[PDB]
Structures are given as structure tokens and as C-alpha cells.
Scaffold this active site. Structure first.
Site, PDB file in Angstrom:
ATOM      1  CG  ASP A 126      46.242  36.098  40.188  1.00  0.00           C
ATOM      2  OD1 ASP A 126      45.299  35.776  39.449  1.00  0.00           O
ATOM      3  OD2 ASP A 126      46.123  36.840  41.224  1.00  0.00           O
TER       4      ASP A 126
ATOM      5  CE1 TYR B 166      44.923  41.924  44.385  1.00  0.00           C
ATOM      6  CE2 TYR B 166      46.355  40.688  42.897  1.00  0.00           C
ATOM      7  CZ  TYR B 166      45.228  40.738  43.723  1.00  0.00           C
ATOM      8  OH  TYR B 166      44.457  39.608  43.863  1.00  0.00           O
TER       9      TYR B 166
ATOM     10  CE  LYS C 205      42.759  37.853  40.704  1.00  0.00           C
ATOM     11  NZ  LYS C 205      44.064  38.513  40.991  1.00  0.00           N
TER      12      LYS C 205
ATOM     13  CG  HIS D 272      39.444  41.290  42.108  1.00  0.00           C
ATOM     14  ND1 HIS D 272      40.532  42.117  41.957  1.00  0.00           N
ATOM     15  CD2 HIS D 272      39.673  40.415  43.127  1.00  0.00           C
ATOM     16  CE1 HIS D 272      41.391  41.724  42.885  1.00  0.00           C
ATOM     17  NE2 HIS D 272      40.922  40.699  43.616  1.00  0.00           N
TER      18      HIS D 272
HETATM   19  N1  LIG Z   1      40.989  36.837  43.760  1.00  0.00           N
HETATM   20  C1  LIG Z   1      41.162  37.349  44.987  1.00  0.00           C
HETATM   21  O1  LIG Z   1      40.278  37.953  45.601  1.00  0.00           O
HETATM   22  C2  LIG Z   1      42.505  37.150  45.619  1.00  0.00           C
HETATM   23  C3  LIG Z   1      43.598  36.742  44.892  1.00  0.00           C
HETATM   24  N2  LIG Z   1      44.783  36.466  45.506  1.00  0.00           N
HETATM   25  C4  LIG Z   1      45.944  36.077  44.644  1.00  0.00           C
HETATM   26  O2  LIG Z   1      46.558  34.943  45.222  1.00  0.00           O
HETATM   27  C5  LIG Z   1      47.955  35.241  45.480  1.00  0.00           C
HETATM   28  C6  LIG Z   1      48.467  34.415  46.632  1.00  0.00           C
HETATM   29  O3  LIG Z   1      47.764  34.724  47.845  1.00  0.00           O
HETATM   30  P1  LIG Z   1      48.363  35.688  48.980  1.00  0.00           P
HETATM   31  O4  LIG Z   1      47.183  36.163  49.753  1.00  0.00           O
HETATM   32  O5  LIG Z   1      49.287  36.699  48.381  1.00  0.00           O
HETATM   33  O6  LIG Z   1      49.183  34.749  49.957  1.00  0.00           O
HETATM   34  P2  LIG Z   1      50.047  33.369  49.900  1.00  0.00           P
HETATM   35  O7  LIG Z   1      49.245  32.342  50.605  1.00  0.00           O
HETATM   36  O8  LIG Z   1      50.522  33.135  48.526  1.00  0.00           O
HETATM   37  O9  LIG Z   1      51.228  33.757  50.898  1.00  0.00           O
HETATM   38  C7  LIG Z   1      52.177  34.792  50.522  1.00  0.00           C
HETATM   39  C8  LIG Z   1      53.108  34.944  51.692  1.00  0.00           C
HETATM   40  O10 LIG Z   1      53.842  33.700  51.890  1.00  0.00           O
HETATM   41  C9  LIG Z   1      55.233  33.963  51.895  1.00  0.00           C
HETATM   42  N3  LIG Z   1      55.922  32.847  51.272  1.00  0.00           N
HETATM   43  C10 LIG Z   1      55.892  32.518  49.934  1.00  0.00           C
HETATM   44  N4  LIG Z   1      56.563  31.430  49.656  1.00  0.00           N
HETATM   45  C11 LIG Z   1      57.052  31.027  50.866  1.00  0.00           C
HETATM   46  C12 LIG Z   1      57.877  29.940  51.218  1.00  0.00           C
HETATM   47  N5  LIG Z   1      58.350  29.085  50.294  1.00  0.00           N
HETATM   48  N6  LIG Z   1      58.214  29.830  52.512  1.00  0.00           N
HETATM   49  C13 LIG Z   1      57.733  30.730  53.412  1.00  0.00           C
HETATM   50  N7  LIG Z   1      56.961  31.773  53.200  1.00  0.00           N
HETATM   51  C14 LIG Z   1      56.642  31.877  51.886  1.00  0.00           C
HETATM   52  C15 LIG Z   1      55.410  35.277  51.160  1.00  0.00           C
HETATM   53  O11 LIG Z   1      56.598  35.928  51.604  1.00  0.00           O
HETATM   54  P3  LIG Z   1      57.604  36.736  50.639  1.00  0.00           P
HETATM   55  O12 LIG Z   1      56.795  37.325  49.508  1.00  0.00           O
HETATM   56  O13 LIG Z   1      58.190  37.737  51.607  1.00  0.00           O
HETATM   57  O14 LIG Z   1      58.630  35.719  50.165  1.00  0.00           O
HETATM   58  C16 LIG Z   1      54.148  36.053  51.563  1.00  0.00           C
HETATM   59  O15 LIG Z   1      54.318  36.653  52.840  1.00  0.00           O
HETATM   60  C17 LIG Z   1      47.935  36.754  45.682  1.00  0.00           C
HETATM   61  O16 LIG Z   1      49.215  37.348  45.652  1.00  0.00           O
HETATM   62  C18 LIG Z   1      47.021  37.189  44.535  1.00  0.00           C
HETATM   63  O17 LIG Z   1      47.752  37.097  43.332  1.00  0.00           O
HETATM   64  C19 LIG Z   1      44.895  36.527  46.863  1.00  0.00           C
HETATM   65  C20 LIG Z   1      43.828  36.985  47.614  1.00  0.00           C
HETATM   66  C21 LIG Z   1      42.634  37.323  47.005  1.00  0.00           C
HETATM   67  O1  LIG Z   2      40.979  41.154  47.018  1.00  0.00           O
HETATM   68  C1  LIG Z   2      42.106  40.715  46.768  1.00  0.00           C
HETATM   69  O2  LIG Z   2      42.511  40.190  45.694  1.00  0.00           O
HETATM   70  C2  LIG Z   2      43.172  40.778  47.876  1.00  0.00           C
HETATM   71  O3  LIG Z   2      42.839  41.712  48.884  1.00  0.00           O
HETATM   72  C3  LIG Z   2      42.845  43.033  48.561  1.00  0.00           C
HETATM   73  C4  LIG Z   2      43.767  43.582  47.653  1.00  0.00           C
HETATM   74  C5  LIG Z   2      43.764  44.949  47.478  1.00  0.00           C
HETATM   75  F1  LIG Z   2      44.677  45.452  46.605  1.00  0.00           F
HETATM   76  C6  LIG Z   2      42.935  45.809  48.144  1.00  0.00           C
HETATM   77  C7  LIG Z   2      42.038  45.247  49.054  1.00  0.00           C
HETATM   78  C8  LIG Z   2      41.963  43.880  49.247  1.00  0.00           C
HETATM   79  C9  LIG Z   2      40.922  43.340  50.169  1.00  0.00           C
HETATM   80  S1  LIG Z   2      40.566  44.127  51.615  1.00  0.00           S
HETATM   81  N1  LIG Z   2      40.306  42.255  49.745  1.00  0.00           N
HETATM   82  C10 LIG Z   2      39.255  41.582  50.472  1.00  0.00           C
HETATM   83  C11 LIG Z   2      37.877  41.927  49.942  1.00  0.00           C
HETATM   84  C12 LIG Z   2      37.650  42.879  48.948  1.00  0.00           C
HETATM   85  C13 LIG Z   2      36.375  43.118  48.439  1.00  0.00           C
HETATM   86  C14 LIG Z   2      35.320  42.376  48.935  1.00  0.00           C
HETATM   87 BR1  LIG Z   2      33.615  42.608  48.148  1.00  0.00          BR
HETATM   88  C15 LIG Z   2      35.484  41.436  49.929  1.00  0.00           C
HETATM   89  C16 LIG Z   2      36.776  41.232  50.401  1.00  0.00           C
HETATM   90  F2  LIG Z   2      36.968  40.289  51.351  1.00  0.00           F
END
Ligand SMILES: NC(=O)C1=CN([C@@H]2O[C@H](COP(=O)(O)OP(=O)(O)OC[C@H]3O[C@@H](n4cnc5c(N)ncnc54)[C@H](OP(=O)(O)O)[C@@H]3O)[C@@H](O)[C@H]2O)C=CC1
Ligand SMILES: O=C(O)COc1cc(F)ccc1C(=S)NCc1ccc(Br)cc1F
EC number: 1.1.1.21
Length: 312
Positions: free
Chosen positions: A44, A49, A78, A111
Site C-alpha cells: 500500500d 507519503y 492513491k 485518497h
Molecule cells: N488511506 C489513508 O488515508 C491511510 C492509509 N494508511 C495506510 O495504512 C498503513 C498502516 O497504518 P499506519 O497508520 O502506518 O499504522 P499501523 O497501525 O500499521 O502501525 C504502524 C506502527 O506499528 C509498529 N509495528 C508494526 N508491526 C509491529 C509489531 N509486530 N509489533 C509492534 N509494533 C509494530 C510500526 O513500527 P516499525 O515500523 O518501527 O516496526 C509502526 O510504528 C499505512 O502505512 C498506510 O499504508 C494509513 C493511514 C491513512
Molecule cells: O492520509 C494518510 O494516508 C496518512 O496521513 C498522512 C500522510 C501524509 F503523507 C501526509 C499527511 C497525512 C495526514 S495529516 N492525513 C490525515 C488527513 C489528511 C487529509 C484529510 Br482531508 C483528512 C485527514 F485526516
């Protein structure tokens, strides 16, 4: 458990993928290489990012090494909010393609539902700190996504952070050509999403759960509830001789969700994949669901007045 879920475009999507938000550019190439070596087949990604070039180096190397074939990978990215314009969508997709070293994406998502003013800044703000919207709506953005399918740039299109009414808007679009394949939303035991999940699943849309571990590395964390440290979740993990993270990953899988935990730690990347040889009971599942508290990792105050901001 079966490793892939069937999408409404006819393609199969691996239910477990590697997240890449916050993965440092100097670490993410190795993370993705390790992930592919230990069995991950879904990554993903997102332009916002700022690490797609480095993700792409890993993908390309593993393809060149013939560790995998391209058809066996499922690469998701995205469209960022500053590219919700007819004339910008294709180029945004193509920049992602070029960075990832790909000639197509398996899935391309809107996104966030909100469009922002185009320009260099990912979050253009007014002098009072409010995001500056674009006038372009989710329906016109969707039509632009449909064109990408018709040009061969993407195999599937979908949405992310769309609320119930926004999904419905998409489904009710006059002249809709392709339904969204996926809605990617935050989902974990403290934000269990039952209502949005049931709506989406009832419509055949597959839901991907992001931040399944509660995003402990989120940059706005405060010393906040912690899934990984919740002794009630630890207890379920202990009972199954698994880690808390493994329980947190298996949980959405048994809800018919896709899940995308992020790590750059090689040992954790491997740990997180070892979730196909145990089952949570129905009682475990209901118990985990009971921890809902409507707590979001991803929300953003600067964007809350945008007409299309998804959350209340
Ligand atoms: N569509 C959207 O708006 C969004 C999409 N996403 C996607 O979802 C993905 C996952 O969500 P994200 O917010 O990154 O967070 P996660 O809930 O996946 O948590 C990531 C964190 O957990 C830690 N971690 C991972 N595996 C373990 C484990 N086995 N034991 C303990 N700690 C662990 C990592 O540490 P470390 O890396 O140091 O090992 C990191 O600090 C994102 O990376 C992105 O690809 C997320 C937010 C928004
Ligand atoms: O967004 C991600 O995937 C992970 O998070 C992020 C990842 C980035 F690389 C940059 C900003 C964000 C933020 S601050 N995201 C939250 C966010 C953004 C836009 C709107 Br509309 C609402 C909202 F809640």
C-alpha cells in the site's frame, strides 16, 4: 485462511499488505524487499507519503531477481487531494507509476474525498490555517478515475476515507461506469467501523483496514489509548500463543477485510505475515469488537470545514 479476496472488477486482492506511510526513504526499500521475500504480495503506497521512488526500487529489484512475477503483485496507490481536477488526474497517476517502476497499478484510490487547490503544497492553507478547497466534486473526480481504467493505467479504482453518504453518492452517480472496488478506511478495535463496513460490504465493495495497530508512530501521538499495550488484547494474544500485533492483524481478516500493517522492522514484517495458521473464535471477535470507542488516528483539524470532510 485463503490469501486473496475477489473484487468487483474480477481480480483477486491479497488480504494482507505492507503499509508504507512513515516508512523512511532510507529504510523502505529494504522493508519492501524483505516483505516480498517473506511472502507479501500487496504493498500500500501513496504519492503523499513521499517514498514511492524507494518503494519502486524494491519492487523492481524483486521483479528483476524473479523472486515474483508482476502478475503476482498487487500494488496500490492513491490520488492526492491537490490532484482532484480533470486535467491533473492522469499525470498524478503517471507520476506514481513512474516512481513505482510500474506500467499499471492494481488499484488506485481517491485518497480522501476532499479536493484541495492544486500547487506544490500538499495542504494549501489560507492565512488562518484552513485548507483551501477545490471546487471539483467526488463525482467528477470519479469520472477521471474511470478514465484511468479505460486507458490501461490501473486495473481497479476505489476510494478511501469515504463516509456512508459519499460511498452512496459514488454508487448513485449518473452514468456510473465502474463501481469502486475498495473503500480503504481506518479500522481497529477502538474504531470498529461496523456501520460503514456493513454498508460497503452489502454493496460489494471490499473494505481495507488501515492503521490496524493504532498507528503508534503517527506524528501527533500523545502519551492516547494503545492497542498494542491493551492487556485485554494481550490476553487474547497470549491464549493463542501469538503476538498482540498478530491478533490485531487477524481480527480484520476474519471480518472479510483486507489489512495493511506498516513496519520497517524486518522481524516485525515477518511476524505480521504469520497470521494464516490460527483462528480467533467468534467470542474473541465479539470481544475485540466490544473495545470500540470511536477513536481515530486519522483526522485533521485544518480540513474540517471542507464541504466534503468525511468525519464528524
Ligand atoms: N488511506 C489513508 O488515508 C491511510 C492509509 N494508511 C495506510 O495504512 C498503513 C498502516 O497504518 P499506519 O497508520 O502506518 O499504522 P499501523 O497501525 O500499521 O502501525 C504502524 C506502527 O506499528 C509498529 N509495528 C508494526 N508491526 C509491529 C509489531 N509486530 N509489533 C509492534 N509494533 C509494530 C510500526 O513500527 P516499525 O515500523 O518501527 O516496526 C509502526 O510504528 C499505512 O502505512 C498506510 O499504508 C494509513 C493511514 C491513512
Ligand atoms: O492520509 C494518510 O494516508 C496518512 O496521513 C498522512 C500522510 C501524509 F503523507 C501526509 C499527511 C497525512 C495526514 S495529516 N492525513 C490525515 C488527513 C489528511 C487529509 C484529510 Br482531508 C483528512 C485527514 F485526516
Amino acid at each position: 485462511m485463503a490469501s486473496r479476496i475477489l473484487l468487483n472488477n474480477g481480480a483477486k486482492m491479497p488480504i494482507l499488505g505492507l503499509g508504507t506511510w512513515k516508512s523512511p526513504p532510507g529504510q523502505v526499500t529494504e522493508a519492501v524487499k524483505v516483505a516480498i521475500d517473506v511472502g507479501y504480495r500487496h504493498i500500500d503506497c501513496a504519492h503523499v507519503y513521499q517514498n514511492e521512488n524507494e518503494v519502486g526500487v524494491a519492487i523492481q529489484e524483486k521483479l528483476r531477481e524473479q523472486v515474483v512475477k508482476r502478475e503476482e503483485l498487487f500494488i496500490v496507490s492513491k490520488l492526492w487531494c491537490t490532484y482532484h481536477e480533470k486535467g491533473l488526474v492522469k499525470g498524478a497517476c503517471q507520476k506514481t507509476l513512474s516512481d513505482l517502476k510500474l506500467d499499471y497499478l492494481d488499484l488506485y484510490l481517491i485518497h480522501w474525498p476532499t479536493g484541495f487547490k492544486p500547487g506544490k503544497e500538499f495542504f494549501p492553507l489560507d492565512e488562518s490555517g484552513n485548507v483551501v478547497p477545490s471546487d471539483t466534486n467526488i463525482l467528477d473526480t470519479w469520472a477521471a478515475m474511470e478514465e484511468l481504467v479505460d486507458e490501461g493505467l490501473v486495473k481497479a479504482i476505489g476510494i478511501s476515507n469515504f463516509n456512508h453518504l459519499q460511498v452512496e453518492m459514488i454508487l448513485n452517480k449518473p452514468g456510473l461506469k465502474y463501481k469502486p472496488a475498495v473503500n480503504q478506511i481506518e479500522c481497529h478495535p477502538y474504531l470498529t467501523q461496523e456501520k460503514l463496513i456493513q454498508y460497503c460490504q452489502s454493496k460489494g465493495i471490499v473494505v481495507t483496514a488501515y492503521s490496524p495497530l493504532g498507528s503508534p508512530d503517527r506524528p501527533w501521538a500523545k502519551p492516547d489509548p494503545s492497542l498494542l499495550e491493551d492487556p485485554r488484547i494481550k490476553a487474547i494474544a497470549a491464549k493463542h500463543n501469538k503476538t498482540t500485533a498478530q491478533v490485531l492483524i487477524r481480527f480484520p481478516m476474519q471480518r472479510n477485510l483486507v489489512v495493511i500493517p506498516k513496519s520497517v522492522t524486518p522481524e516485525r514484517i515477518a511476524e505480521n505475515f504469520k497470521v494464516f495458521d490460527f483462528e480467533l473464535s467468534s467470542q474473541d471477535m465479539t470481544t475485540l469488537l466490544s473495545y470500540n470507542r470511536n477513536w481515530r488516528v486519522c483526522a485533521l483539524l485544518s480540513c474540517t470545514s471542507h464541504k466534503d470532510y468525511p468525519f464528524h
